[PDB]
Amino acid sequence: PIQTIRDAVVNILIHFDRNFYQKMKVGVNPRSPGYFIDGLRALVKLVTAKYQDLQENQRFVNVGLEKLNESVLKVNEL
Amino acid sequence: RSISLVKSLTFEKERWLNTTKQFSKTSQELIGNCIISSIYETYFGHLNERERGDMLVILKRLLGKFAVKYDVNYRFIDYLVTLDEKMKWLECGLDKNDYFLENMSIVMNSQDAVPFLLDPSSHMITVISNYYGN
Amino acid sequence: LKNLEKRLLEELNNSELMVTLNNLKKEAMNIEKKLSESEEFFPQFDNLVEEYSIIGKHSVKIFSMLEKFGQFHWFYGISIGQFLSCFKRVFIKTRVDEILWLLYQEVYCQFSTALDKKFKMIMAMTMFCLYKFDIESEQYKEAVLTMIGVLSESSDGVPKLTNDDLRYLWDYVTTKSYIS
């Protein structure tokens, strides 16, 4: 039962693997979990990279906004 | 001079305000966009554009089903292709087709798997040779 | 412009500097003005694309036909390079209509020889269909379609003739000269 984003995301990944191997018409022939594993590792590394990039960009934008606010306060004081 | 600098940087301040407003939406949809892009890299190499759009329909249905929101105007080239790399590929010999750009991104963003190329025109040999040089 | 925006962000985050910021802003404004000045060539390109779109669509239809030929037998396949060389030799060997007609003639003369007599005849009939169904009118298209139908014994019915060229074809059908 789902209480976090992780169980949901695992459900998207398994459902997509099932739909993919269903429409490939593999039939009785076995389905390799290689696509599933590769997608999981790619998702892990890409979530880490995107979160780091978004944090860095948000920190830079916040620093610029703070500098602009300080300059505006100095201009209003003077 | 301070007033002139403020008037010049008002556009940058508005752009920063727009970025700060869109930061919440980006943080909300980051997990869904990462899911769709990783599924791109690990599934969509060996498919044509019709099958790619089909599994966009199924994948977006699954993201909307399990309450994970994504970008409505999402694109693989925009998400995982920089302008520097796009110009580098186009000047090294890659075609201007969006399908070829997506395939090139799949090829060049695969560091854990050895990429297999199906190029009946034998053009990607020259493209990757010009990309990597000597 | 993107690199200059990144450099400006890194310069403001790291902090004379006002002169460098003014120089970067002037460079960005000059780049934007150059882009706006160079963005005036769009209508000519749009007009050229709208002029040559019919030839492009007809060539795509011809290439799809030849790919469907190549799916039937392993010797009949076609690549984009040979088709593009055949397109290139057209200019070497109603301007839009003339270019399209020479395209049809040269593609048939180049790629008909790689087929047997039955597939040559199928190719000629289908190319005639693609040319005439676009150039001529709906009554012409339905007359050719019902002539092919009565040839294939799939649809029976006389076309509503007004053309002058189809008199010979109708004589061939009524006189049972199927090869002719």
Side-chain angles (χ1 to χ4, degrees), chain A residues 1-55 57-58 61 64-65, chain B residues 23-129 131-134, chain C residues 8 12 28 43 48-49 51-87 89-180:
Chain A
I2 297 184
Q3 278 82 30
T4 175
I5 192 48
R6 286 182 224 271
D7 311 331
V9 161
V10 171
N11 286 118
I12 293 95
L13 291 159
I14 299 175
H15 267 285
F16 190 84
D17 197 70
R18 296 291 183 184
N19 294 359
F20 189 78
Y21 275 120
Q22 267 180 23
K23 66 94 175 180
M24 292 296 173
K25 302 182 285 290
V26 69
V28 181
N29 313 295
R31 332 176 173 204
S32 172
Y35 283 146
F36 189 63
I37 297 154
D38 288 346
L40 275 161
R41 317 184 155 150
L43 175 66
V44 160
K45 64 93 176 179
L46 196 44
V47 167
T48 296
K50 277 302 178 158
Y51 200 59
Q52 188 144 352
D53 278 337
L54 175 79
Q55 279 187 317
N57 276 332
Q58 195 42 59
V61 167
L65 276 175
Chain B
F23 162 71
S24 180
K25 173 190 198 274
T26 300
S27 185
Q28 281 323 107
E29 304 167 341
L30 190 136
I31 191 66
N33 291 350
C34 280
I35 282 179
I36 300 183
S37 58
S38 299
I39 277 174
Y40 286 163
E41 297 177 271
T42 68
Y43 282 82
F44 280 100
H46 57 100
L47 315 174
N48 59 5
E49 282 289 328
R50 292 183 291 113
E51 288 169 337
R52 286 193 188 180
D54 285 338
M55 290 296 171
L56 269 295
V57 175
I58 291 90
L59 185 52
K60 284 177 181 143
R61 159 168 74 76
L62 285 175
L63 274 295
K65 174 191 299 178
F66 280 104
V68 188
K69 65 178 72 66
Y70 58 95
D71 201 355
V72 56
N73 290 348
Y74 172 75
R75 263 161 55 74
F76 178 50
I77 297 169
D78 301 338
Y79 212 74
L80 294 175
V81 171
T82 78
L83 275 297
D84 300 288
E85 298 296 323
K86 207 182 61 180
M87 294 298 103
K88 185 155 179 31
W89 302 338
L90 288 172
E91 88 179 40
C92 284
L94 188 81
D95 304 75
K96 297 203 217 151
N97 208 348
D98 73 321
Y99 173 73
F100 269 51
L101 292 172
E102 291 167 12
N103 285 9
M104 203 43 169
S105 191
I106 289 180
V107 162
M108 294 296 172
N109 295 115
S110 86
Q111 308 307 310
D112 299 345
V114 167
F116 201 100
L117 304 171
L118 187 61
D119 195 11
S121 68
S122 311
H123 182 71
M124 294 299 104
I125 292 183
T126 57
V127 167
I128 300 173
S129 313
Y131 186 87
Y132 279 108
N134 291 333
Chain C
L8 176 57
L12 62 86
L48 282 179
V49 172
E51 205 207 346
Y52 295 145
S53 69
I54 170 167
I55 307 179
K57 288 164 218 201
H58 275 88
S59 57
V60 174
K61 270 199 295 199
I62 286 168
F63 200 78
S64 179
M65 181 182 72
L66 288 166
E67 273 182 352
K68 278 149 198 185
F69 278 162
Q71 293 179 356
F72 295 144
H73 196 277
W74 52 268
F75 197 68
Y76 295 164
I78 191 166
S79 60
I80 184 57
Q82 283 177 345
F83 185 78
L84 284 183
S85 307
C86 182
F87 192 64
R89 80 179 66 250
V90 167
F91 300 98
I92 289 147
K93 181 185 197 168
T94 54
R95 170 68 168 163
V96 167
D97 306 307
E98 173 83 10
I99 287 178
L100 189 61
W101 186 78
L102 293 174
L103 170 60
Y104 267 91
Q105 295 297 109
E106 194 56 50
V107 165
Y108 185 77
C109 288
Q110 183 62 255
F111 298 124
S112 81
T113 71
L115 318 167
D116 55 83
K117 65 182 291 294
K118 151 202 180 184
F119 270 74
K120 271 161 181 157
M121 274 194 297
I122 289 157
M123 187 200 203
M125 185 180 289
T126 309
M127 291 216 186
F128 190 86
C129 284
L130 277 70
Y131 195 81
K132 293 319 201 174
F133 287 2
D134 183 86
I135 294 306
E136 266 71 22
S137 75
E138 190 73 29
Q139 63 85 30
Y140 198 104
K141 172 175 184 180
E142 72 176 0
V144 170
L145 183 62
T146 188
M147 263 165 211
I148 295 182
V150 66
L151 263 172
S152 171
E153 284 161 22
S154 67
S155 78
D156 301 336
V158 58
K160 311 157 204 178
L161 272 79
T162 81
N163 264 315
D164 53 337
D165 287 89
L166 281 72
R167 308 280 158 100
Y168 299 149
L169 194 44
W170 182 255
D171 288 5
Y172 283 159
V173 175
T174 47
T175 53
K176 277 75 177 175
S177 310
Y178 298 109
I179 290 308
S180 287

